Amino acid sequence: EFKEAFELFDRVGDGKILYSQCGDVMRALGQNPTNAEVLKVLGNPKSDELKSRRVDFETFLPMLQAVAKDYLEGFRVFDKEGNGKVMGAELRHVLTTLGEKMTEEEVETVLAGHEDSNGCINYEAFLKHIL
Amino acid sequence: EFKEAFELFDRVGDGKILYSQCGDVMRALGQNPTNAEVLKVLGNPKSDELKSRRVDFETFLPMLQAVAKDYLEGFRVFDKEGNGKVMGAELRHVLTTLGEKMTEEEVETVLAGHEDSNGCINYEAFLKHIL
Amino acid sequence: AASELYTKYARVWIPDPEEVWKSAELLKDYKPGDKVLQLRLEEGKDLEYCLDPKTKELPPLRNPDILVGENDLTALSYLHEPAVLHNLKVRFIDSKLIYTYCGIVLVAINPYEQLPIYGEDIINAYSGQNMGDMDPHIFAVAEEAYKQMARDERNQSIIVSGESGAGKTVSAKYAMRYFATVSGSASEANVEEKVLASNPIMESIGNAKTTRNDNSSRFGKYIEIGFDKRYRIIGANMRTYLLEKSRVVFQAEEERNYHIFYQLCASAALPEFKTLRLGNANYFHYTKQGGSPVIDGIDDAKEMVNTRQACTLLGISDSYQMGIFRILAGILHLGNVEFASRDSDSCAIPPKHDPLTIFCDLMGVDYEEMAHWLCHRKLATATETYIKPISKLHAINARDALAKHIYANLFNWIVDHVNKALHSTVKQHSFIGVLDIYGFETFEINSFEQFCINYANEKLQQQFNMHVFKLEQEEYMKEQIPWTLIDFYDNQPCINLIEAKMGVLDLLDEECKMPKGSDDTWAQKLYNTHLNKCALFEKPRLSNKAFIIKHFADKVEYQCEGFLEKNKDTVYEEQIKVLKSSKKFKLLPELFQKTVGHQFRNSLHLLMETLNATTPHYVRCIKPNDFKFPFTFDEKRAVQQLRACGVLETIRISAAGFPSRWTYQEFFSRYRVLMKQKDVLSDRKQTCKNVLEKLILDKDKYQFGKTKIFFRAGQVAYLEKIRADKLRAACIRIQKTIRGWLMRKKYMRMRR
Amino acid sequence: AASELYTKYARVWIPDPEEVWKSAELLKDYKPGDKVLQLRLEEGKDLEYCLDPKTKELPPLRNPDILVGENDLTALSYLHEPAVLHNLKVRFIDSKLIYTYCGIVLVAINPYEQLPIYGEDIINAYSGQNMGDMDPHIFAVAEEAYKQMARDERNQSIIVSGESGAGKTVSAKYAMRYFATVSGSASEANVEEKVLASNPIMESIGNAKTTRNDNSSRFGKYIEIGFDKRYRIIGANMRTYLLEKSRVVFQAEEERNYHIFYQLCASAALPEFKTLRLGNANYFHYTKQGGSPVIDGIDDAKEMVNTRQACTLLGISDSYQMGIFRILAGILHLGNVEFASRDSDSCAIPPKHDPLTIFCDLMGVDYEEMAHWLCHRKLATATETYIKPISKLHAINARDALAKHIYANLFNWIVDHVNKALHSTVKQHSFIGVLDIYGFETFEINSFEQFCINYANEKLQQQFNMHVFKLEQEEYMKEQIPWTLIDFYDNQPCINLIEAKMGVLDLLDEECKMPKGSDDTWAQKLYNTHLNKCALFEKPRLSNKAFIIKHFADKVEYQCEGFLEKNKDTVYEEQIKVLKSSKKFKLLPELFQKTVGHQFRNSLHLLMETLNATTPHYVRCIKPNDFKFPFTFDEKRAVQQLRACGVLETIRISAAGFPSRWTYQEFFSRYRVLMKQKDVLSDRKQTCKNVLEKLILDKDKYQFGKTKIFFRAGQVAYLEKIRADKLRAACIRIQKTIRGWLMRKKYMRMRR
Ligand SMILES: Nc1ncnc2c1ncn2[C@@H]1O[C@H](COP(=O)(O)OP(=O)(O)O)[C@@H](O)[C@H]1O
Ligand SMILES: Nc1ncnc2c1ncn2[C@@H]1O[C@H](COP(=O)(O)OP(=O)(O)O)[C@@H](O)[C@H]1O
Ligand code: BEF
Ligand code: BEF
Ligand SMILES: [Mg+2]
Ligand SMILES: [Mg+2]
C-alpha cells in the first residue's frame, strides 16, 4: 500500500520523489504532521534543497514510521459561548493568518457547504468529516 | 524595443506568449494597468483560457496602445496626520487584503529598506523610487 | 433608507410565513428605479422579489453575523424588527441566554427549564456592580432600582409585563428575593421572611391551573416594599386588582379552581379538618368541572402545610385559620346544593339536604332561613316590598353569585391581614413598588374581563411611552437639537374613548341604571355616540351586539353579551344578611363590613397616581412557545408578544429617529480620509459640518449638536461604504504602480 | 518585570549618549539566568548587551508603533521613561503637536513658531466641550478648571511650570485670555479688558532679555481671577515674588535691564519727556552693560505707547505716569554718578556733576544733601551715633543698593495700584488662581536666589505629589484594595532641612544678627548642625564655603558667598530719608511708607495656604532646545526637564504600582480561552479569581477589587502572550488535520 503511493508522486522516473513532496506523501497515507514536524525529519534545509534534492522509498520509510507515534479541543478554543458552534469567518481568518498559514483556496475547499445561514459551523460533525 | 520584449516572454517557440502573460509584458514596457483593465482588453475569460490560449505580437500591439491613454494622492490617503509619512505595517496590510491583493512576498520585495526605525515610510521618495 | 447599501452580496431580510422573516442575498446591484431585486435564498435557489411602488421601501438589511447576539442592541448597524427577533432567537436557542437588554427594557424569555443563575452567590455577584459590567439579569434591574432610589432620592417601580405563562410572577418574585437579601435586617423582627411569606398565601388563594399556566395568577398585584432612611427593608403593603371571581364556580376543561380548594380537599383526612366533612376534589361541583384534580409535580397536601406555616408567620391565629378553612369548605358544600323545580318560576331544596345542612353548620346559620332565601327573592317597588319565588335556573345563578361574593370578601380579608402583619409603625422613607398584572389580551370571544385588562394596559403603556420620550427629550436638549424632531406613541385618544364622559364605561354605567337597559340597548348607545365619530371605534360588519376598539397592540372585538350583568355584579341581599347575622362564628361577619367598572376606574387611577410619581423599570417577559417546552421558540408568537408590550413600536421610533450619535472628534478621526486638505480647518467641528454637508446633500439625514452629530438610519453605513470605496481605489492605485515596477525589474533580469 | 516577553524579535530600548535611548531588537529568546542579550541595532549590526546582576533588570520594552503618538498615554502597553520621551518627540517633530496629556498633567513643548490654534474660533470650540472629546490644548485645561469650579463648588488653581524660555508666561496668558472670553461682561465696566491690560504693565517692569529668553520674567506671579455667583469675571488680585533687584544695576553680556528702561530711552525725544534729559540706552551705565540695546523684532518706542495706554486704562493719571517716568529716569542718572577717591577710606562727587544735578531735579531733593550721604555713613554704637567717610568702592555699592531699593518700591507701588484698579466692590463668590513662577534651577554657581526658588519648588512639588496621591487613594478605596499599596514621593524632609528650626534659613537669620557673623562662620554652623546628621545635606569634598542639598530634582551645590549680605539687603537709611523728605514730588515719598529669607518664608507660606485650599491643574512646559529654533528637539534636555518638574517620578510610581485595571467581565471575555470548562462557574468574578491564581502564581502581581482586577506592569502583556500561544497551537492542530484531509483527497484523485 505504501509502495503504490510513493510511486504515484515520482513525476520523472528516477525512482525518487522530491524533498518538498515528502510531507504530501505522508499525509496521503493517513498521517497528520505539521509543516515543522516534517521539516525536522527532513534535515531542516534551505529553499535550495527543498526544490532540488530527491529521496527513495527505502530512505523514506524511516520518516513515515518516525511520524507514526483531542483534535476536538482545538475547535473548542474558538467557541466563544461553549455552544458547539464556531464562526466560519473567524475560522477562515485564523487559518489564513495564524500558525502555519493556509491559502484562501485551501480553506475555501474544506469549508464549502459546512457553513449555515448564520455563518456558523457545527464543529463536531465538521471534524468527523475531515477524519 | 517592443519586439525585443515580446520575444523574451515566449517560452515555447510558437511566436506567441500565453494569455496570462499579456499583463506582465505591458508592465515590462512601462505601462501601469490594473488587473481588471488588462482583463477587459483580453476578453474577460475564465480560468480555462487564461492558462491555455496564445496570441502574437501583431494581435498584441492594439492592446499595448489601448492601455497607453496623482499616484501621490493614493499614498496621502493612508497618511493619518498629513505629515508626509505612512506606516509600513498598515501599508503591508492593505496591499495584501484590499483591492487587487498582492502576496506577502511581492510587498516585502518593494518595501524592503524603505521603512525607518519607527515603522514609517517617507512616501514621496518611495513613489519616485517605484517610478 | 439608503439605496447605495443594496449592492451585490448584500444580505437582506424578506417576509416568510413560518419564521416571519428569512434571509436573502442580492445577486446584483440595485439601480435606482428598479422594480425588483435579484435574490438568492437558502433553499429554492433564486427569486425575483417585487418592490411595492407608492410606498417605495427596500427590505431591511441584515447585520453582520459578528455583531449578532450581544447583551444589548447598541452596536448593531441596522435596527429593525428582524434584527431584534434574530438577536433574541440566537441568544435563546444557540446560547440558552434568556435575558437581553433592548433599549431601556430587560427582555426575559421563559426557558421552561431550571437554570443555575438565581442562587445567593449570584445575588451577591450583582450587588454593588454597574449594570453595564454584568450580563443581563433580573437581579441587575432590581440592583439598579435599589441604587437609583438613593442616588435620585426618588421612589422606584418595577413593572413586569407579558402574556399568561410568560414569567411575570417568577420575575417579580426574584426581584423581591433580591431586595430581601441585599437590604436585610432593619431589626430582629425578621421583616424579610414575612414579606416573602406573603407569596405562598397569595398564590394559594389567587392562582389556579389554566391551560396556559399551571400556576396562573388570576389577579393583578402591586406590592410596595418600604425602606427606612438607611435603605433597609421595614415592611410592605399590597394592592390587588381584577380577581377572577367566576373561577370559584366554573372551570373549563383541563382547568382547576383556586389552588387552596385542592390543598383543602387533599387534607380531608386530617383530624383538625373532620368537621369540614370534605370529600376529594372530584366530589364537589365547584372543583370537579375541569376533570383535572391533580397538577403534574404539585403535591396539594404538602402545599397546604406550607400555606398554614406562612399564615402563622404572618400572625393569623389557629382559630382564624380554621375559620378561613370553614368558609372555604362551606363554599364547596354550597356548590353541591341542588334545587328541584316545582314549575317554570319556582323551586325548592329537597328535605334533609346534606350539602345545605353542612353549609349551615360551617357558616353558623339556620337551615330554614338559608333554604328560604336560596329559593326566593325580595323585590322593591317605590311604594312597597314583596317576595317572589324564583326558577331553578335563577336559584342556581344566585347561589353561584353568593359563592363568588363570599370568596372575594374572604380574599380581601386575607390581603388586609397580610398588610397588617407587614405594616411598619414608622413611616417608610422610600419605596420600590413591584407590579405583576395581566398583559394585553385578546381571544376569539372578548368580554368585560378583557376590556378592563386592556384599559389597564393602555394606562401602563402610556407611562412607558412618556418615560421613554422624557429620556429622549433630555438627550436632544443637552445637544441643542430641537426636541420636536422626536416621535412618540399617544395612548390618550384610546384612553379617552374608554374612560371620558360619554365614553364606553360611562355609557355602560348609564345603561345599568335604566330599568329596561340591556346589552342590546347599550350596544345601540355605543353606536349612536361613537360610530363614525371616533377613529378608534368600529362596529363589526355582521353584528349589532359587538364593538371594536383599536388598542395600542391590535384591534379587539368585544361582545356586548353580559357586560351589564358583569358591571352590576348583583348578589341577593337577603342571602348575605343571613351570613352577616351568624351569631357564634366571629370571622364570617367580618367579611361583610358603585359598579365594577366605576370601582375599577377609581382603583386604576390610584395605581397610576402612585406609579407616575416613581421612576419605572421595565421587564418584558415573552412566552416563546405554547406548550411549556424547554428552550423552544416560535417566531410568530414572539413577534406578537413584542408588539403587545410596545417594544416593536419603541424600536421603530428609535430607528426612524436619529439613532447614530458621534462626537466631532470621532467623526473627524474616522472620515478625514473623505476630506480634501483645503477643507481641513483648525476648528475641527466647523470642518465636520462643511464636509458632511457636501457628502450627504439631504439635510433631513443629520443634525449638528453642541458636541455630537446625530444621524438618521443608514447614514453612517453609507459613509462607511464610501470610506471603504476611497480606501479601495487608493490601494488599487498603489498596487498597479508596484506591479509595474516589479515587472520592469523582472524584465531587466531576463534581458541580462 | 516579565522575562517571558523577551522573545526573539521583541523590541527594547537601551541607553545611548546622544538620544538618551536607542531601539534594539532581540535576535534570540532570553532564557532565565542569561548574563547577556543578543541584540540588533539600527546601525552597527549586532551587539552583546550586558545585564547587570544584583540589580537584575531587563531593558524597557518598546510599545508597538501603532500605539505611539496618541493624545494621552492611557493605551500604551508599557509605561516608562523611554515611552514618554518617544511619544512626546514623535508628536512634536513628526506631527508638530506641542500639547499632550501625561496622566493628570498637560505637557506643552515650546515650538518657537507661531501656530494657528489660539484664535477666538478655537476658544469657542473648547467652550462647553469635555476634555476627552478635544485634542490637548491649554484652552482645555482652562475650560476644565472653569467647569470644575461650579461643579465641585470649589476654587481652582492653574500651576504652570518649566525652565526659563519653556513657555510658562505664554501658557498663563492664554489661560487668562480664555477665561476673559468665555465668562465675560459682569457689567459695562469692561472688567476683562482691564485684567488683560495688567499684562503689558507687569511685563514692562518685571521682564528682561536674558540669554535664555528675550522676554524673561524676573519675578513670580500669582493672579487670582474673581468670579461672581453666576461665574462671570468681576476682577482680579495679583501677588509677586522674588523680583530680581540685581538686574536694575548689573547685566551680563548679551542681557538687558528691565524692558521699561529701553522703552523710556527710545522715547527720549518725545516733548513730554524733555525734562528727563534721557540719552539713548548706551548712554547709561545701568542699561549699557550687556552690549545689547535692541531685541530682534521688538520696537521699544512702540512698546512704551502700549505701556502708557495700559496704565491709563487702569486709572493711573497722566501726572502719576510722569512721576513713574521721572523716578525711572532718576535711577538711570543715578547710575551715571561717578565718585573720585580721596584715599583708601574716603571719596567725593566732583563739583557740578551733571548726573547728580539731574537726579536731584528729578527726585525733588537737594544736591548738597544727596552728595553728602552718597559719600558718608551714619554708624551707631549703643551709647552714641557718629558719621564716617566711605571708600569709592563702598559708595558705588551703596549707590547701587539705593537704585535697587527705589526700583523695588516703585514696582510694588505699581502692583498695588494695578490691584486697586482690578478690585471688585462686591466680594468674589469664587476664584481661579494662575501661578507663573521660576522652575527648579541650578547652574555652575548657585547662590541665595537659586536657594529661594528651589525652596518654592519643593513646596509646589509637595502639593502636586499629594494631589496625585489623594486621587490614587480614592481609586483604591472605591475598589476595596488597600491604599497602603500606594507609593509617593515625600518632599517634607527636604522642606524641614530648609525651613524648620535649626535649618538652613533659621541658621542664616541667626548668623545675620551676630556682629562678627560671616559667610565663613555660617558655613561652619551649617556643618556643625547638619553634616552627617541629615541624609539630604552634604559638604563638597574640596570646599569649606559651600553646601549641597538633595532636592527632588537633583543635588544642588550652593556657594555661601554673599548669602548673609543678600539676606540682609542693607540700604543706607540716610540716603532713603533724603528721598522720603522730597517736598514737592508727591509720588516719591509714597514709595517708602525682617530679613529677605524670613519675608520669603512668610510670603511662600501665604501662597501655599491659598493654593492648598484649591483644586490644582498642572501645565508642564518644556523648552526643547537652547537656541530658540523652530520645532527642534533635544532628548537629553527634554528628559532633564521632565525630571525637574516631577513627571518622571510620577510615571515611575504609576508604572511600578497597579497600572492595568480590568472589570471581571472584561477579563472573562478576553481570557475565557485560557480556562478549562470545569473551572467556569455561574459566578464569573469567582471564576476569574480561581483562574488567575493558577495562571500567575506570584500574588504580588495582582489584587482583586470589588469590580476590577488591578495588575502590576507586564501582567496583561504576559496573559496576552500565553493567550496568543493558545490560539496559535489550536490553529496549528486544525491546520495539520485539514492538510491531511486535502492530501488524502488529492491522492484518491491521482489514483483514479
Ligand atoms: N426564569 C424561569 N426559569 C424556569 N422556569 C420559568 C422561568 N420563568 C417562568 N418559568 C416557568 O413558567 C411558569 C409560568 O411562569 P409565571 O411567572 O407563573 O408566568 P406569568 O405570571 O407571566 O403568568 C413557571 O411556573 C415556571 O414553570
Ligand atoms: N505656544 C507658543 N507658540 C509660539 N511661541 C511660543 C509659545 N510658547 C513659547 N513661545 C516662545 O518662547 C518665548 C518664551 O516663552 P515664555 O512664556 O516667555 O517662557 P517662560 O515664561 O517659561 O520663561 C516666547 O516669547 C515665544 O517667543
Ligand atoms: F398566568 Be400568568 F400569572 F399571567
Ligand atoms: F524666562 Be521665563 F519667564 F522663566
Ligand atoms: Mg403570574
Ligand atoms: Mg515668563
Any idea what DSSP says for residue C701? G
Grid coordinates belonging to D624? 526643547
Those residues whose C-beta lies under 8 Å from the C-beta of residue D41, and which sit 6 or more positions away, are D22, D23, D24, D47
Nearest to C730 by CA among C654, C667, C673, C682: C673
Task: Please give the single-letter amino acid code of residue C397.
Answer: N
User: Checking phi first, is residue C189 left (phi over 0); if not, alpha (psi -120 to 50) or beta?
Assistant: alpha
Residue among D217, D307, D409, D491 flagged as catalytic = D217
Q: Is the dihedral of CA C507, C508, C514, C518 positive or negative?
A: positive
Size of interface B-C (CB pairs under 8 A): 83
Q: Are strands C615-622 and C156-161 parallel, antiparallel or unpaired?
A: parallel
CA of D438 to the centre of ligand 4 (A): 7
Q: What does this entry list as its resolution, in Å?
A: 2.0
Contact C222, C610 (CB under 8 A): yes
**Chain C contact set for B94 (CB, 8 A):** 727, 731
Those residues whose C-beta lies under 8 Å from the C-beta of residue D604, and which sit 6 or more positions away, are D241, D455, D456, D459
Contact A67, A26 (CB under 8 A): yes
C-alpha R_g of chain C: 32
Atom 25, ligand 2: which residue's CA is nearest? D215
User: Checking phi first, is residue D744 left (phi over 0); if not, alpha (psi -120 to 50) or beta?
Assistant: alpha
Look at C739 and B107 and tell me if their CB atoms are within 8 Å.
no
Task: Compute the distance between CA of residue D628 and CA of residue D634 in angstroms, rounded to an integer.
Answer: 12
D49 to B117, C388, C471, D37, D473: CA distances (angstroms)? 19, 118, 62, 5, 39
Q: Please, what is the angle between helix C81-89 and helix C647-656, to 10°?
A: 130
Query: Which residue out of A115, A118, A122 would a mutagenesis test of the C interface target, given it has the greatest number of C Cβ atoms within 10 Å?
Result: A118
Grid coordinates belonging to C594? 358603585
DSSP letter for each residue of D20-69: EEEEEEESS---TT-SEEEEE-SSSSEEEEEPPTTTT-PPPBPPPGGGTT
Task: Compute the distance between CA of residue C370 and CA of residue D488 in angstroms, rounded to an integer.
Answer: 90
**Three-state SS letters, D295-356:** CCCCCHHHHHHHHHHHHHHCCCCHHHHHHHHHHHHHHHHHHCCCCEEEECCEEECCCCCHHH
- Whether D213 sits among the annotated catalytic residues: the reply is yes
Grid coordinates belonging to A34? 505539521
Q: How far apart are the first and last CA of chain D?
A: 60
The 3-state DSSP class for residue B65 equals: helix
- Whether C216 sits among the annotated catalytic residues: the reply is yes
Domains and CATH numbers, chain B: 1-70 (1.10.238.10), 71-130 (1.10.238.10)
Task: Compute the distance between CA of residue C109 and CA of residue C85 in angstroms, rounded to an integer.
Answer: 12
Ligand nearest to the CA of D208: 4
Q: Is the dihedral of CA D680, D686, D692, D693 positive or negative?
A: negative
The 3-state DSSP class for residue C154 equals: coil
b or e along C547-561 (b: 16 or more beta carbons within 10 Å of the residue's beta carbon)? bbbbbbbeebbbbbb
**Chain B contact set for C681 (CB, 8 A):** none
The 3-state DSSP class for residue C234 equals: strand
**Chain C contact set for B95 (CB, 8 A):** 731, 734-735, 738
The 3-state DSSP class for residue C178 equals: helix
D733 touching chain A per CB within 8 A: yes
Task: Compute the distance between CA of residue C219 and CA of residue C438 in angstroms, rounded to an integer.
Answer: 8
Neighbours of C629 (CB within 10 A): 13
Nearest to C748 by CA among B29, B65, B130: B29
- In chain C, helix, strand, coil percent, each to 5? 50, 15, 35
Contact C281, C266 (CB under 8 A): yes
D293 to C594, D509, D730: CA distances (angstroms)? 104, 39, 77
Q: Where are the alpha helices (DSSP H) in D52-190?
A: 81-89, 120-126, 138-152, 168-182
How remote is the C-alpha of A130 from its chain's centroid? 11
**Looking at the DSSP assignment, which residues form a beta bridge with residue C47?**
C39
Nearest to C62 by CA among C96, C93, C86, C27: C86
Query: Which residue out of A79, A80, A81 would a mutagenesis test of the C interface target, given it has the greatest number of C Cβ atoms within 10 Å?
Result: A81
Look at B127 and C740 and tell me if their CB atoms are within 8 Å.
no
Look at C684 and D116 and tell me if their CB atoms are within 8 Å.
no
**Chain D contact set for B118 (CB, 8 A):** 65, 68, 90
Q: Where are the alpha helices (DSSP H) in D207-313?
A: 259-266, 285-288, 300-313
Grid coordinates belonging to C672? 478625514
**Looking at the DSSP assignment, which residues form a beta bridge with residue C24?**
C12
Task: Give the chain C residue nearest A115 (alpha carbons).
Answer: C42
User: Checking phi first, is residue D235 left (phi over 0); if not, alpha (psi -120 to 50) or beta?
Assistant: left
Half-sphere exposure for B113 (CA within 13 Å, toward CB): 6
The 3-state DSSP class for residue D202 equals: helix
Task: Compute the distance between CA of residue C381 and CA of residue C384 in angstroms, rounded to an integer.
Answer: 6
Contact D290, D261 (CB under 8 A): no
Distance from CA of C654 to the nearest CA of A (A): 26
Task: Please give the single-letter amino acid code of residue C382.
Answer: A
- Whether D44 sits among the annotated catalytic residues: the reply is no
Atom of ligand 2 nearest to the CA of D138: 1
Widest distance between CA atoms in chain C: 133
Neighbours of D632 (CB within 10 A): 14
Task: Compute the distance between CA of residue A26 and CA of residue A63 in angstroms, rounded to an integer.
Answer: 9
Task: Compute the distance between CA of residue D412 and CA of residue D676 in angstroms, rounded to an integer.
Answer: 76
Nearest to C475 by CA among C485, C465, C489, C463: C485
Neighbours of D624 (CB within 10 A): 24
Residue among C169, C207, C210, C660 flagged as catalytic = C169
Query: Which residue out of D43, D86, D94 would a mutagenesis test of the B interface target, given it has the greatest number of B Cβ atoms within 10 Å?
Result: D94
Task: Compute the distance between CA of residue D340 and CA of residue D352 in angstroms, rounded to an integer.
Answer: 13
DSSP letter for each residue of C623-666: ---SS--TT---HHHHHHHHHHTTHHHHHHHHHHS--EEEEHHH
Contact D650, D468 (CB under 8 A): yes
> Which residue among D133, D663, D682 places its CB closest to the CB of C707?
D133
Q: Are strands D105-109 and D615-622 parallel, antiparallel or unpaired?
A: parallel
> Which residue among D42, D94, D96 places its CB closest to the CB of B117?
D42
Atom 1, ligand 3: which residue's CA is nearest? C216
Task: Compute the distance between CA of residue C615 and CA of residue C158 in angstroms, rounded to an integer.
Answer: 9
Grid coordinates belonging to D669? 471575555
Contact C138, C108 (CB under 8 A): yes
Contact C371, C356 (CB under 8 A): yes
Task: Compute the distance between CA of residue D140 and CA of residue D121 in angstroms, rounded to an integer.
Answer: 14
Grid coordinates belonging to D653? 510610581
Grid coordinates belonging to D268? 527720549
Contact C222, C238 (CB under 8 A): yes
Q: Are strands C615-622 and C105-109 parallel, antiparallel or unpaired?
A: parallel
Grid coordinates belonging to D467? 494631589
Element (H, E) at D643: helix D635-644
CA of C208 to the centre of ligand 3 (A): 9
> Which residue among C42, C66, C95 places its CB closest to the CB of A81?
C95
Contact C303, C259 (CB under 8 A): yes
Residue pointed to by grid coordinates 553728602: D372
Task: Compute the distance between CA of residue D452 and CA of residue D152 in angstroms, rounded to an integer.
Answer: 34
Neighbours of C407 (CB within 10 A): 25
Q: Are strands C430-436 and C156-161 parallel, antiparallel or unpaired?
A: parallel
Nearest to D465 by CA among D492, D439, D484, D444: D492
Q: Please, what is the angle between helix D392-421 and helix D573-580, to 10°?
A: 50
Atom of ligand 3 nearest to the CA of C216: 1
